[PDB]
Design a binder for this molecule. Structure first.
Ligand SMILES: Nc1ncnc2c1ncn2[C@@H]1O[C@H](COP(=O)(O)OP(=O)(O)NP(=O)(O)O)[C@@H](O)[C@H]1O
Ligand SMILES: Nc1ncnc2c1ncn2[C@@H]1O[C@H](COP(=O)(O)OP(=O)(O)NP(=O)(O)O)[C@@H](O)[C@H]1O
Ligand SMILES: [Mg+2]
Ligand SMILES: [Mg+2]
Lengths: 804, 226, 226
């Protein structure tokens, strides 16, 4: 009897739409979370291929062996890289060279491009960059004097995964083994030996070891990851990762909104039934049993079908995604299941708790006659408490990331603006007179029930804001990535260029059908002090390195300028904003630089937001033109070539002093990473927008189900199809237009905070969004409403369906 | 035309398979302009079903139904809805009042559908409702009212329709002798003035006696009583 | 309890601010056990409101209600529900039926709420329903019935519990003469053979006359009439 009753209820339109909406929300969250987690894990695995290590530890001196012994006990793979640059002698030809001592583990991941291939640093053997023995006039299989050792030339070093770009290079690379450090006889406890430690293993082992090692550190050793040597390519990966998390969060938020409204409607549908049960003497025990049994059965069925649908979606999508993926992604973690079931349960309980207690403490006749229900838990106190609980739970789930806080700030501004604008709109419309009949009907319907209208409007605004925020963020990220790697780019660099040699090469570049590029003149030095305080002692990478300076007459085109004014005058130099922040310096600070016994002083007058991602060289300091003539003015240029190399030989004969660097390997490396990240963003955006559209359809269907009785009465009276379709069009168009207008402000605020705090991109108020979001939202809502109303009005004996 | 309603061999059954049940087993009925026909019968004889099928709210199993010279079995839903809006007024058993809007909007509805100005329709509905004896419950919701008030609201809506043909299901179901008498006087005055044909399914013997013709529904058949 | 129902200067008003509206203005009523009293009055006189008050389904502004000798006002909702289950059967004016339960289960529901057996309550409900001549619509949903059938279903649901006191609102409102007489006979037989006090609100003159006392409700005051 009870089973047949439950099944009959489950076939009623109201319960049916509630179940469908809940199941769709669960499928939404589960599938999106699973896809996001698997794809991010695949991205991390891909990133492991260019680092030879999952995590990196950096220090200027040897760490105690106890930590590495613990890591080995912790079942972790450890590699070591402890080297710097020093002098070498190819007989009697001194030459600076950057050596690199690595253990047999390295390369732990990836591949070591060598000529001939398949060579590793062994005792008594060294591998050298082609420029190195091109200048040293030695060949493979010969012997080279390094420090106080004579080691055989095993082969060349075409490329290594942990190379970076380093446009301001000085000396080539010399691969060599960790065990032969002492035999060099040239290593000194002076300059940093660039102590780097690579750790690899499962996520749990790495996390536990990191937590174990966190208190055992000093402010000279940094634990990090996705930060390659030299070039900061991995930063892009990091950005992508954040985006993925954001996407998941967005879906979650969307789901919550739908569930809320759906469940609210469901609760209302039960009102009269509870009254009847209270009339028949149903005690508290039996009433609780029946009502919460129906609620729990609905929740369980919705969860089950949602899980099944989400799993089916995930499997079919990953099958259909075989060409895009480079390899099968690892299985997802379990946290999406929590992220779905827990949110649906908690939102359901939060929405349904108040009506349950309210009904349990009100005489049935008051409920039936729509009279004054018991004044318990007023909305003015219930709503803030619910919002606080929800946001606290969201903080717990997310982990206190700035993404959640930015989203919440946007949502709060959106809600406040929504209330104000709704009140103003009601006041305006109460005094407004129209002429079109469908418009009059829509306006009257919107005005008659203000609070329900406001709830619907707020939900739609939230959905539109989330979608628009995601779309704009995707556009900005794609534009930034496209700008980072132009389709054509100089694949060759020229360094160690004398000033008087600038004119010849240019002509040669003009001669050999090559477009010349910028000619940044570089001077290497070290800052002596800031505000007369000797900087020796502060832990900054800038202090223990040869800083590079340049002088530009005009504004740097590709380098944006944010703070200060351009150009800096005498004894004033534009500086990078990030370096100023990490160095805690202000404008006009007395900074003196020591180089070639020509220590010159300058001030600070402008800060430029410099992105360390483009292949174009970037300088922390841009001195005024002709300010450091005493220092040796080196020159550096770049050009792109794609066919043959004989002209390269001609240039080498022409200027054997000038060094030539190829970066085709680096371009190949970055291209795959960029392509994979872009595919990730495209797929995530498509999935989220489609499923958000589905949730919007669900919300609109529920909203129309609310107005079912009025529509049925209208049809019975004899309203034509055209009139009903037009009225629904107009009503939902106004609703969507206002909702999108509010969502524009909300999305702008959240996006501004997110860019200023997470993705470090400049924020510009885009009126194009202001004009696109409201119109598009109104059109979408009108389309959905018209279609669903046309579907509903069709049929016969509609008057009989009024009772349902 | 003079033949307002023509019904030939009307048959209607409901249910599916074992649940199939026959209600109308061959019905014939011809009415002229301005006539007043009261319909009586035992409970569950199908009177409401016959009334619904007469007004084109649904479709019979088989037969010929013509209203104002239009064969109701030969147009789609839209033409039927247009005809209903043009000519017919209806009063149901449960009155299907919209619980969201107050009484005034419920009475206002048909005038807005016709296409009058909002103020004109508002004052007209107000005058009609005051005429029906409900001038003190204008803003009440349908739940707030009582059975008699809800019935009078439905009657007010039908009257505001100002129809050529008026169908009623128990106009005086929830009314005493006094309010029932006033309602009957209202209906018959309307018939005398506007010449509106009146079909009503009633249980009161007085109202049937006042009516021009009395038809009893037995075994899905029509029998003249007087 | 010699007097099942005791009312002492009970007043009740609805609405707030200018929208306030008084209905009951002090009522004194004592209902000896086993008596039959019929309430009459014009529409909008508050009869349904008073009847709802007497069963504890609502609370008035002030007064004393002593249903079966209990201080209803000094009694929470749960005890009220328990008392109603034990001793009170109620009938609505709109039949307030659950639209997703067929007639048999709808009648059976009070027994299940009281925790009675499925089989015995089932056969008892079957006997009650066939007693009302609804034996051919046992599995029908409420949307499949007419006004008379729905009213008879509500009456059967009231009769199922065999309560000490039975409240009825227009028991024969939507029924013909013969069916109304049959229903009245069943009610009076129940009272005679079970000593069940019953309070009806109806516009039927014959049904009221058959009752022991007839009280007219005027201006929130009860006066004996017939
Ligand atoms: N949807 C349905 N499915 C099956 N049977 C139905 C359905 N609707 C109505 N019936 C049956 O048909 C009968 C006639 O219904 P209805 O047309 O309301 O009769 P009526 O003469 O109006 N009865 P009343 O208003 O109580 O005097 C009902 O009493 C049921 O027995
Ligand atoms: N919830 C309410 N809010 C405001 N006014 C109400 C409410 N309920 C009832 N009323 C008013 O009180 C009057 C009495 O209600 P009710 O108790 O249904 O009267 P009644 O005598 O039962 N009418 P009827 O059923 O037509 O014979 C109504 O007609 C309304 O004017
Ligand atoms: Mg009927
Ligand atoms: Mg009443």
């Amino acid at each position: 009897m009870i089973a047949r009753w439950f099944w009959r209820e489950w076939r009623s339109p109201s319960l049916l739409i509630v179940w469908l909406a809940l199941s769709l929300a669960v499928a939404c969250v589960l599938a999106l979370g699973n896809i996001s987690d698997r794809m991010e894990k695949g991205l991390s695995q891909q990133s492991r291929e260019f680092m030879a290590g999952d995590r990196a530890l950096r220090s200027s001196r040897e760490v105690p062996q106890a930590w590495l012994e613990e890591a080995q006990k912790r079942g972790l793979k450890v590699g070591k890289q402890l080297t710097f640059a020093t002098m070498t002698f190819a007989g009697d030809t001194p030459q600076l060279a950057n050596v690199k001592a690595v253990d047999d583990i390295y390369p732990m991941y990836g591949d070591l491009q060598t000529n001939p291939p398949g060579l590793k640093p062994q005792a008594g053997s060294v591998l050298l960059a082609p420029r190195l023995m091109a200048l040293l006039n030695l060949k493979t299989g010969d012997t080279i004097d390094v420090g106080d050792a004579t080691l055989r030339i095993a082969g060349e070093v075409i490329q290594e995964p942990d190379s970076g770009f380093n446009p301001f290079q000085m000396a080539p690379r010399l691969m060599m083994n960790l065990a032969d450090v002492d035999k060099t006889g040239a290593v000194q406890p002076g300059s940093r030996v660039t102590w780097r430690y690579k750790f690899g293993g499962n996520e749990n082992q790495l996390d536990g070891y990191e937590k174990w090692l966190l208190p055992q550190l000093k402010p000279e050793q940094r634990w990090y990851g996705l930060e390659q040597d030299e070039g900061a390519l991995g930063r892009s990966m990091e950005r992508s990762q954040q985006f993925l998390l954001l996407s998941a969060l967005l879906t979650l938020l969307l789901a919550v909104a739908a569930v809320a409204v759906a469940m609210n409607h469901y609760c209302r549908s039960r009102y009269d039934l509870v009254a009847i049960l209270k009339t028949l003497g149903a005690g508290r025990a039996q009433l609780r049993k029946l009502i919460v049994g129906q609620w729990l059965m609905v929740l369980t069925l919705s969860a089950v079908t949602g899980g099944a649908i989400g799993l089916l979606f995930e499997n079919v999508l990953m099958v259909l995604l075989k060409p895009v993926l480079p390899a099968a992604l690892p299985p997802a973690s379990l946290w999406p299941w929590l992220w779905a079931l827990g949110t649906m349960t908690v939102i359901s309980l939060l929405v349904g708790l108040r009506p349950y207690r309210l009904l349990l403490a009100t005489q049935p006749l008051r409920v039936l006659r729509n009279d004054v229900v018991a004044n318990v838990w007023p909305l003015k106190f219930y709503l803030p408490i619910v919002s606080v609980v929800v946001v606290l739970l969201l903080a717990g789930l997310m982990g206190g990331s700035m993404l959640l806080w930015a989203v919440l700030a946007g949502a709060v501004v959106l809600a406040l603006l929504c209330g104000v604008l709704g009140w103003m709109l009601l006041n305006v419309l109460r005094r407004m007179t129209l002429k079109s009949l469908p418009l009059r009907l829509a306006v009257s319907r919107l005005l008659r029930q203000p609070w329900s209208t406001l709830s619907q409007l707020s939900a739609f605004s939230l959905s539109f804001m989330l979608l628009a925020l995601l779309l704009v963020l995707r556009g900005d990220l794609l534009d930034r990535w496209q700008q980072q790697l132009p389709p054509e780019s100089p694949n060759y660099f020229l360094i160690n260029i004398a000033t008087e040699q600038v004119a010849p090469l240019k002509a040669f570049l003009a001669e050999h059908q090559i477009v010349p590029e910028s000619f940044y003149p570089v001077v290497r030095a070290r800052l002596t002090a800031i505000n007369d305080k000797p900087t020796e002692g502060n832990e900054d990478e800038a202090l223990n390195r040869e800083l590079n300076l340049t002088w530009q007459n005009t504004r740097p085109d590709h380098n944006p300028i944010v703070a200060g004014n351009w150009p800096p005058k005498a004894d004033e130099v534009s500086m990078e904003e990030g370096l100023a922040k990490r160095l805690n310096v202000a404008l006009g600070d007395t900074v003196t630089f020591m180089g070639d016994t020509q220590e010159f002083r300058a001030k600070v007058t402008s800060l430029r937001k410099v992105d360390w991602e483009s292949l174009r060289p970037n300088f922390y300091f841009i001195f005024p033109e002709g300010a450091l003539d005493g220092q040796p003015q080196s020159w550096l240029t770049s050009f792109r070539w794609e066919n043959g190399n004989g002209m390269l030989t001609q240039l080498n004969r022409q200027f054997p002093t000038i060094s030539l660097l190829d970066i085709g390997a680096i371009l190949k490396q970055v291209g795959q990473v960029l392509e994979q990240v872009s595919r990730a963003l495209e797929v995530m955006v498509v999935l989220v927008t489609a499923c958000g559209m589905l949730l919007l359809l669900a919300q609109v269907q529920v909203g129309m189900r609310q107005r079912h009785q009025e529509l049925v009465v209208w049809r019975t009276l004899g309203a034509g199809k055209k009139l009903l379709r037009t009225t629904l069009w107009c009503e939902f168009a106004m609703l969507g237009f206002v909702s999108g207008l509010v969502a524009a402000i909300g999305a702008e605020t959240a996006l501004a905070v997110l860019q200023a705090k997470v993705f470090d991109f400049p924020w510009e108020p885009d009126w194009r969004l202001w004009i696109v979001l409201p119109c598009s939202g109104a059109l979408l809502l009108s389309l959905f409403g018209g279609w669903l109303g046309a579907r509903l009005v069709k049929g016969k004996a509609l008057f009989r369906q009024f009772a349902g | 035309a003079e033949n307002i309603v023509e019904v030939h061999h009307l048959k209607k059954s409901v249910g599916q398979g074992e649940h199939e049940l026959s209600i109308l087993t061959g019905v014939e009925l011809v009415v002229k302009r301005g006539e007043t026909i009261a319909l009586v019968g035992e409970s569950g004889s199908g009177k409401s079903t016959l009334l619904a099928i007469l007004a084109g709210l649904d479709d019979g199993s088989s037969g010929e139904v013509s209203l104002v010279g239009q064969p109701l079995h030969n147009m789609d839903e839209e033409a039927r809805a247009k005809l209903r809006a043009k000519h017919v007024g209806f009063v149901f058993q449960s009155f299907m009042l919209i619980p969201t809007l107050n009484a005034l909007e419920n009475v206002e509805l048909p005038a807005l559908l016709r296409g009058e100005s909002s103020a004109e329709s508002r004052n007209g509905a107000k005058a009609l409702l005051e005429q029906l004896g409900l001038g003190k419950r204008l803003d009440h919701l349908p739940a707030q009212l009582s059975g008699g008030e809800q019935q009078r609201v439905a009657l007010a809506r039908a009257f505001n329709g100002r129809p050529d043909v008026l169908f009623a299901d128990e106009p005086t179901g929830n009314l005493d002798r006094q309010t029932g008498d006033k309602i009957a006087d209202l209906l018959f005055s309307l018939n005398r003035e506007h010449g509106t044909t009146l079909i009503m399914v009633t249980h009161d013997l007085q109202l049937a006696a006042r009516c021009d013709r009395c038809l009893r529904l037995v075994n899905g058949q029509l029998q003249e009583e007087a």
